[PDB]
Design a protein around this ligand. Structure first.
Ligand SMILES: Cc1c(-c2cc3cc(NC(=O)O[C@H]4COC[C@@H]4C)ncc3c(N)c2F)cnc2c1NCCO2
Ligand SMILES: Cc1c(-c2cc3cc(NC(=O)O[C@H]4COC[C@@H]4C)ncc3c(N)c2F)cnc2c1NCCO2
Ligand code: NA
Lengths: 290, 290
C-alpha cells in the first residue's frame, strides 16, 4: 500500500489541533510543497500492533471510492506513530456548523441522514462498525459532501479498547462470557442506526435527548426496563415522515432494528428534492449568516 | 433500617486507610465508646441519589445473618457520603496473607472454597452478583472465618461507575444494548463460579493464570475461539478432586457451569475435616513463620 516510512513533518506543517480531544490527536496541516490543507490523524502504535495487519487495512482505505467516506490521501509510519492524511473540511463537523447556523431544516437533516446511511451501508458491508455516529463526527467538506471517517484499523480499535480496559478493571479473574461482552462492548452494526436517529434529533434540536441530565443518571435511565426511545419535542415542526424515521431508527430491540440498506428506502431519505444544494445553502448560511 | 444521619466522625477515630485504592475509600477505625475496631467504607453519594432505594437496600444487609458475609454494624449518611460500619479483620484478605505465608495447602484452599461457595449461594439467592471474587476480596477474621463482602446497593454501583466514566465516553448517543453492557450487563451470576476457580488457583500458586501477561493480551486470548480454560501447573502436587474442582468451575460455557449450590456437593468441598482450624493454623504461620 506504500505507507511512507518518513516523519510526516518532512512534508507538512502542523497548524492547528482539531476536536479538543474528541477526535484524538488530529491536526490541520499545510502541504509544504503545494500549500494544500490536509488533516493528519496520529494513531499511537503499540509494539504489539502487527504492521502486517496495518498494511491490509490501509490498502482497503486507499482503494475506497465511496462518496460518503472521508478521502484517504496517504499514511506515514515514524517512531511507532501512524499518521493518516485526509481531506481537510473547512466547515468541520455538523456540530461546528449548527452551533452557528442553528437548527437544520428537515430536508437538510433528511439529506444528511441519507448520505450517512449510504456511508454506514458501505462500512457495514465491510463488517465494520462506526460506533460513534454523532454531529461532531459527520463532516461537511468544502464541496458540500457528507462523509464519515473510516478508521477501521486495529491500531485505532486497540486504542479505544485500551480505554475499555481501564473501565472494566483487571481481567485475570473474569469469566470468558464477561471478557467477550466487555470486549465487544455491546457495539453492533445496528447500533450505528440508533445513533443516527439520535443524531437526527441532535441536528433538529441542537442537542441529543436527555442532554440536560448528567451522564451517570442518563446511563441508569437508559438501562431501565421501561426505558422508552426518545422523540422530537416539537410535534408540529416536523412531518410524519421525520417522526417515523426517528421511531423506526430508534427501535429498542437490535433484532427488530432496520439495517442501513433497508433504511435507505424510507420516505424521509428517498423523498424528492434531496440534493447537494441543501448543504450549499447551509454552508452559505455558515459563512455569511442570515 | 435506621441509617444514622449523624456525623460518623463523632463515633469513630479514623486510624488508617485500607487497600491502597483497590477497596476504594476504606478506613480502619475505633469506636470511641466501646473501643472495638471496625472497618468503615466511605461511599460517595450523588446529590441525585434516591434515598428510598438506599434504605430498601440497607435493610437487607442489616438483617443478613450469614456466616460467610461480613457483618453489618450500621451506616451513616453525612455530607454526601455513605459510611458503612463493618467488622475489621486484622489479618486482612487472603492476598494480604499468602503474600507472607506462601501458597496455601489443598485442605486450606478447599475450606476457603466451600465457605466462599456458601457465601455466593446466599448472594445469588438474592439475585446479587459479586463480580469481584478474588483473594484480595476474601477476608479472614481472627477466628478463622471466611467472609465475602456484600456491597450490592445502588449507591455503590453508581459510585464505582462515576469513577470510570472518564474511560467510556458520553452516553447520549449510545444504543440501549451499548448502555446495558457498559453497566455490567450481558452475563450471569455463574461468572462468580469461574472467578472462584481462578481464585483457587490464585491461592495455590500466588498468582492467577496468565498474570505475567499484559491484561489486554489476556482479554484477547480469552475471547479467542479455542481458548483453553486454565489448570494447575504442577499436577502431582494436587489431588484429583482439586483438579476436577478447577475443571468444573472453569467451564467455558456458562450454560454448563454449575451453580454455587451445585458445587457445594463437589468432593473437594464436601470432604470432612474442613473447619476454621485450618485457617487458624495459617494465621499462626502468618504471625511467626514456619
Ligand atoms: C471526525 C474525526 C476526525 C477528523 C476530523 C476532521 C476535522 C476537519 N475539520 C475541522 O475540524 O474544522 C473545524 C476546525 O476549524 C474549522 C472548523 C470549525 N477536517 C477533517 C477531519 C478529518 N479528516 C477527520 F478524520 C479524526 N479523528 C476522529 C474523528 N471522529 C472521532 C474519532 O476520531
Ligand atoms: C474487601 C473490600 C472492603 C473491605 C476491606 C476490609 C479490610 C479489612 N482489614 C484489612 O485490610 O487489614 C489489613 C491491613 O491492615 C492489617 C491487614 C493486613 N477488614 C475489613 C474489611 C472489610 N469489611 C471490607 F468490606 C471494602 N470495600 C471493598 C472491598 N473489596 C473491593 C470492593 O470494595
Ligand atoms: Na496455572
Amino acid at each position: 500500500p506504500d505507507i511512507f516510512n518518513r516523519d510526516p513533518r518532512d512534508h507538512y506543517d502542523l497548524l492547528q489541533r482539531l476536536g479538543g480531544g474528541t477526535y484524538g490527536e488530529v491536526f490541520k496541516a499545510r502541504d509544504k510543497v503545494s500549500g494544500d490543507l490536509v488533516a493528519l490523524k496520529m494513531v499511537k502504535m503499540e509494539p504489539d500492533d502487527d504492521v502486517s495487519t496495518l498494511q491490509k487495512e490501509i490498502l482497503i482505505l486507499k482503494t475506497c471510492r465511496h462518496a460518503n467516506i472521508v478521502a484517504y490521501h496517504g499514511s506515514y509510519l515514524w517512531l511507532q506513530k501512524l499518521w493518516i492524511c485526509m481531506e481537510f473540511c473547512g466547515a468541520g463537523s455538523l456540530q461546528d456548523i449548527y452551533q452557528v447556523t442553528g437548527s437544520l431544516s428537515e430536508l437538510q437533516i433528511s439529506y444528511v441522514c441519507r448520505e450517512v446511511l449510504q456511508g454506514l451501508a458501505y462500512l457495514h458491508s465491510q463488517k465494520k462498525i462506526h460506533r460513534d455516529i454523532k454531529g461532531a463526527n459527520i463532516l461537511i467538506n468544502d464541496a458540500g459532501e457528507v462523509r464519515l471517517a473510516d478508521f477501521g484499523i486495529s491500531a485505532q480499535i486497540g486504542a479505544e479498547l485500551a480505554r475499555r480496559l481501564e473501565f472494566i478493571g483487571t481481567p485475570y479473574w473474569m469469566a470468558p462470557e464477561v471478557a467477550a461482552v466487555a470486549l465487544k462492548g455491546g457495539y453492533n452494526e445496528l447500533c450505528d442506526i440508533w445513533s443516527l436517529g439520535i443524531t437526527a434529533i441532535e441536528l433538529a434540536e441542537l442537542q441529543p435527548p436527555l442532554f440536560d441530565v448528567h451522564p451517570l443518571r442518563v446511563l441508569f435511565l437508559m438501562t431501565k426496563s421501561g426505558y422508552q426511545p426518545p422523540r422530537l419535542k416539537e410535534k408540529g415542526k416536523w412531518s410524519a415522515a421525520f417522526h417515523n424515521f426517528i421511531k423506526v431508527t430508534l427501535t429498542k430491540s437490535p433484532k427488530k432494528r432496520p439495517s442501513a440498506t433497508k433504511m435507505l428506502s424510507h420516505q424521509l431519505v428517498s423523498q424528492p428534492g434531496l440534493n447537494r444544494g441543501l448543504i450549499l445553502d447551509l454552508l452559505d448560511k455558515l459563512k455569511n449568516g442570515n
